[model samples]
Target chain A: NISDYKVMTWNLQGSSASTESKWNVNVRQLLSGTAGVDILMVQEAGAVPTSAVPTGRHIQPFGVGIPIDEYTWNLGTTSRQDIRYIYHSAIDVGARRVNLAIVSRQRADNVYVLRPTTVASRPVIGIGLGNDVFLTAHALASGGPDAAAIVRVTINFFRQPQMRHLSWFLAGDFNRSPDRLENDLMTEHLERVVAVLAPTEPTQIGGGILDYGVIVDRAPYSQRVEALRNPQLASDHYPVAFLARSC
Target chain B: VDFVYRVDSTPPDVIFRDGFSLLGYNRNFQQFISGRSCSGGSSDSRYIATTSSVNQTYAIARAYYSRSTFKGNLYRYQIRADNNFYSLLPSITYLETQGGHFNAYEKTMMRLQREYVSTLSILPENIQKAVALVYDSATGLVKDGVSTMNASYLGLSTTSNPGVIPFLPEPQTYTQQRIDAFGPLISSCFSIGSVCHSHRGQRADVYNMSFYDARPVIELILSK
Candidate 1:
């Protein structure tokens, strides 16, 4: 039997409104209480609030990237106790403060970064989770040329023998939309799962959607994405929750 | 340049204002273009051919709309660029057939829906420039083999330079079969409607959709 898991990715926007404390509160409530999310992939994060670790569970040791002034805008993941963090690492995306992080719930046989040769922004953080379950997280630059080059590099990276056998999911603030990628080779290899639900439902305020969840193998699951909105949250960007049901 | 569309003078009653339809149009055009570009085909030639057919389909639909039997019925297909000052129709016309930055494409489409809801005039020179900009950039990236950032659908390195890094992977090449596999669904999205036929016989009108509906289409191109 397969268990359904709730995976979420969010850009906390901690630098805005000086709301790091509010996120700490919001994050704790999400983990300790009823939100029932099994794993959280955070972007633009400050130090992980050990208080939000849900009592018995612990946070995996994730590397740090560049920092701004006194703030370290890092990326991290926190999961429930049932899923252990077997491997973790981080890289500064293009020498920028935005860190790309990856943590696997199972032992990772290999881990590396898929950085494009042209774009100077965040790289794709890859983790080869045991049993052929691979995971990657990324936050791309906003320029059209830069964005396109990164994608080309990624396509080349996927063809390597090491990544050939794994079933994988690439999730986070892609800063691009799905339709644009529909006719490319990625569609033939992967399916866009959690996606922008509507034009009115934007993940970032005053903009079109830029976050997504994509997978190479989609037959065993059904998925949908929601842009979480709450006044209590402080980021200009909304947290995107991806609900994947595997049977 | 001056953009002009076929259905500009009078508003069509059954304007297809649905986002899904526009999305479908965009995707179908992309597939048609990708099928052309990746299979050693030309994007400009394909765009010329596609819009030519779309114009013809709309004309046929216009005749049907003009019939007295359908006079009382409200069935005119319309989009936001239908009545625009400059006309996004030109951009949409060209963009549908080419793949580039996902956010740029999405933002351009969204901008038209929100601002240009009313228009097709073709400026061949401008279209050529736009297509060249995308193509030239792609060619440069492939030739240089420099590691950059990740894309909507898609990449690492270290260096002595402060903000730059050396890429570790070998240069890549692809087979025509791989590129051909990049084409969208073999059949049209629908079998009827002028909008459907506008996309080189592929259905461009998607009735139900979400904002990120075509993620994989653009993703595939970026990966390539």
Candidate 2:
């Protein structure tokens, strides 16, 4: 029997709040409550200098890698206010940052940063394992001056030489809705892996809801898989989880 | 809507007595396969062949025979031969109905078959109409006012197999079920209403078909 695993995808609104005390409280709550996720995908993590600090007490300065230029503003608002953060148990196997030091529990057999050559907005991360399964997470475009973050990452995880046997997944906070032409363009090759967890109302905040998880596999394991979106959290968007056995 | 057409040859001087029926014409020479039936009596003669072969053979047969006049719309033949039978032989041919009395509807059905089966070019228009007609008819049976169980049968539930209602895109595989659950929202340009239906206290019988096997069925019939 394959082992059971729990994976969660969340869009942690970086470490920002209207007030410093509230931001700290929400950060702590998010970290403590979400520590259960085995594999987590987070968006809006890079820091903005003017934004309020994230909540979790454990969130410390791992290192200062890249800072957002004040001139980069999303919409009419300054881009300095929006940031992203991903937190996980440091003790978990394969946890380390290849580019920016984000916390991770699982040591990625291979890590790739999509569009490393481009000087545009946020980057997309693809994690791969030797066991024919590939997982990717991205914090895409903010719909600013450039075209939407259209980064393509391909993972080669097939144990065998045959290309047909490979299993892969491409996921991220693709700033576009699931039905948008841009979203479709990203998921055209891979089978759509995740969906909105709950009914969204017009009164809800943010551009409706924009997030997803996509999986591509040769077998039928997805039938037994479940994805959930937890909206009660502090992030601007809810977190998504996937439960399935690794092949 | 893509069609597969084929043709079959007939000997000269064979008086083709075309008759109409809901299913198709009946011919003593034609062998019926599983899921197929001869609706009208013996008077309605017919020929059954693979859609692909029907078009090809019909063209050759029509060109070779002077007395053979084509019948019905040029499209709308929707017959499939068993894969086992199709694989064993390269191709097979059958004769048309000899004689029979057809009602107006049956005549229309026969005309459709002739226009469709006479040549090898499978007409998508006819196939789409036939599929739409079947879908509408099936849905019509369960619609409110048409039946006494209107209020109770408001909508369909996927859990129930052999239920009175039907699920869109027919759940034949696990992925399909997820796709069905996601419905149009997953592929929509904007967030619409709930893609999944909220189930009440409805009951249904369930059946399973391997996606690997059922994929061809969906691809052949529903694929654009």
Candidate 3:
């Protein structure tokens, strides 16, 4: 199914002071600020919201990354469209737990946490049907002992491992500049995907485009990408906006 | 008000007793590590204690940091007994936040127009912020060297010039690797540390650093 829509990937930088952080409020605004934000693949959502908290060890009601290994088998999937989707770390208190959440406009039945494809079992995952999206998010520090270790590892381990899977939406604060080693060796991976943003424009607060969104599928689509200034969003990373063309 | 961005890391399981730890970057931009340790707390026990801009002690700390981040050339230390030092040094925060118990932290941090600032020799603005970055670099690597970096960095910028910018850059990418590099570097200063012109592992925003001198030196330029 050829589907096209706007997908935004952001790093909440949960470790930031609190929800009231000037950028935090602004980021939350940007969340609904845009007209058509179909899916929000947010990484670093530190705490589980009040409504999201479940009874105990399990963050419950809303799914989170806590007890991640266990949560994989027992995700608290909900059909509550108003609350869309969530994956929080297993913790009574969400503050200590940092997680990845994929909130989408699609029905719950249509979306899922896709884990362990034949090629790899990454730390982060999201795959879907109705709207047809699959994604992965990571905050990376990579590689083996080398002068350019993170560069080598990102391309070899992180980026390469990404395309090896199915047509998933690979996203996150991959935290590397596209023009740098972050793009090397993995240029071919773009063959089936659109980078969305320009390598010339940086997405992170510091100026190098770090956050990413790679949508791979057949029947190509078109879109534009932008790095917003803030809620100036709390993290060094600015939120990445992907405007997927509706086809 | 200049707000610094960065991730936060709690101190290691170990308690703060004494001695000094150093932190620095090497030629490869790897975390230059090394430092002092203590049997227990002493009158000398306190992080960033006394003060001196002297090079002898500072040189040792500097040399230690070079071990991890070094292309191996060396440079630059200090202490000024002034009222500003308290604010600049972050006091003894083994138990408290960097700016301590007030909005002095808040008020003094109010943003302002651009000022003539020395990027290289820029004095520390908020010790709490700097301390947080170094500790984050330390603990982050300690946990992250073998664990997930996504959540750690995902939660916050964790350091500055450009907070979490280290996520993509070379010197900072290897921050986890440098945890060991900064080994003794931070500890040497933890003990009522001296304010020598020398610093342990100078807290840095590995993400957005642009120095003409070491800028070229830190290039981890790779060939695929």
Candidate 4:
């Protein structure tokens, strides 16, 4: 049986001192070993300038470039340098480098960003796919009275012109834990939405499982999320991988 | 203007155990630069002045003898213009004479002779004219022995065989027959010794024999 393609999102910490120490030899080993991934989204890739101040002295920069394939694309930059996207086996269906948007499997026709008027406001957006499914990434406010701003924006996006007919999957680094008041406000508008899949724990530094993913109008094809455990080598935050197949 | 100069014929400081000696000589020559008048106006007068020429010779005693041991000799010759500071001339000669002074040992001598000739050929025509007199005198002894040896060793009847005569065998048991049987040895001596002139034509014949018998065998073994 053919398996559905998997997507993995990881926030690789700046540069791991231990990993960069053996950069040349270890990079070749890692690329050869991790040859089994369909879609990989990495953050804080830690790419330095080609002809920078040698290798030993301080002041290093991080960015990404298409070193391997011709079809690869890149998005953001660290302060100035550009970030890269490495596409190996798959074709570049459609890609964008916007700040809060969905890297959709299908082409994106339109996108909208909801801004907050107050200090406690959070950003929310809906990305349009051909069908009636919208993927949204939210960044909830970090502990303030405006913690309810994300819910209002999310509801407004769902009521927009073309997005009203679509279902939504909202995922992001929600700064508050699942049991807090912030998560409750998000669940009040959408029903089929689920919180951290069982045994919720902190996905990052602060405390408790903060980042979350919720699906609407669709049964959890495989509703499971866990901590990636090893953040020493690549990233500071654990990656969250979810698999879903169409009915 | 033409004066003959000869080497002292003294024994060389560094001599091979096999009786090879190297000799060096200094000779003077005069060159006419330009013609000018004594009044220093437009008169034709020639200027002649003597300049020294340093010539080195490597001589090998053309006698064969048996030896229990042998040592090779390496000689480096450096000549400089004492008045002109940074001008240097250098040459190297290697002489090993353990083996008998038959035709086989002439290979080294032939190489030295060719080097000497080529070096003189590169000099300016004027410099060559000035030194030709002395160089001719120095080579007189070498030419005398070499010509006679060349003819006799080639088996051509000579007025007098100036080359070394082989030790005669004891009289009685067919000595002349034995001497005649040594034709190959005498022929090899002639061919190798005459490498300067005669053997140049025999290169193709020697090369063909070597290619079929020795070259392929060596190449086959090396490839494996």
Window of ten residues with lowest summed lDDT in model 1 chain A: A66-75
| lDDT, residue A73, model 4 | 25
Worst 10 residues of 2 chain B by lDDT: B188-197
Backbone collision tally, model 2 = 42
Please give the distance, in angstroms, between residue B207's alpha carbon in candidate 2 and its true position after superposition. 15
Model 3: lDDT equals: 0.32
Query: Per model, how many backbone clashes are there?
Result: 48, 42, 76, 8
List runs of model 4 lying over 4 Å from the truth: A1-8, A12-107, A116-122, A132-141, A144-148, A181-183, A186-199, A218-233, A245-247, B1-224
True contacts recovered per prediction: 0.00, 0.00, 0.00, 0.00
Error of 2 at A62 (Å): 23
Cα error, residue B210 of model 4, in Å, equals 84
Candidate 3 wrong stretches, greater than 4 Å:
A1-3, A16-24, A33-36, A53-82, A89-98, A110-122, A142-167, A181-183, A187-200, A217-219, A222-231, A245-247, B1-224
TM-score of chain B of each: 0.20, 0.19, 0.20, 0.14
How do the predictions measure up, each by TM-score?
0.38, 0.33, 0.36, 0.31
Candidate topping TM-score: 1
Interface RMSD of each: 17.2, 26.1, 24.5, 47.5
Model 2 C-alpha lDDT per residue in residues A1-247, reported as the tens digit of each score: 0012345555555544532332344333433321233344545544322343343332221112222111111111363222233332211114332222222233344443443233443444444432223333443345322113332333222223553333444444555554452454345542232322222321114555455555543322333344555555654666555544211
- Cand. 3: chain B TM-score: 0.20
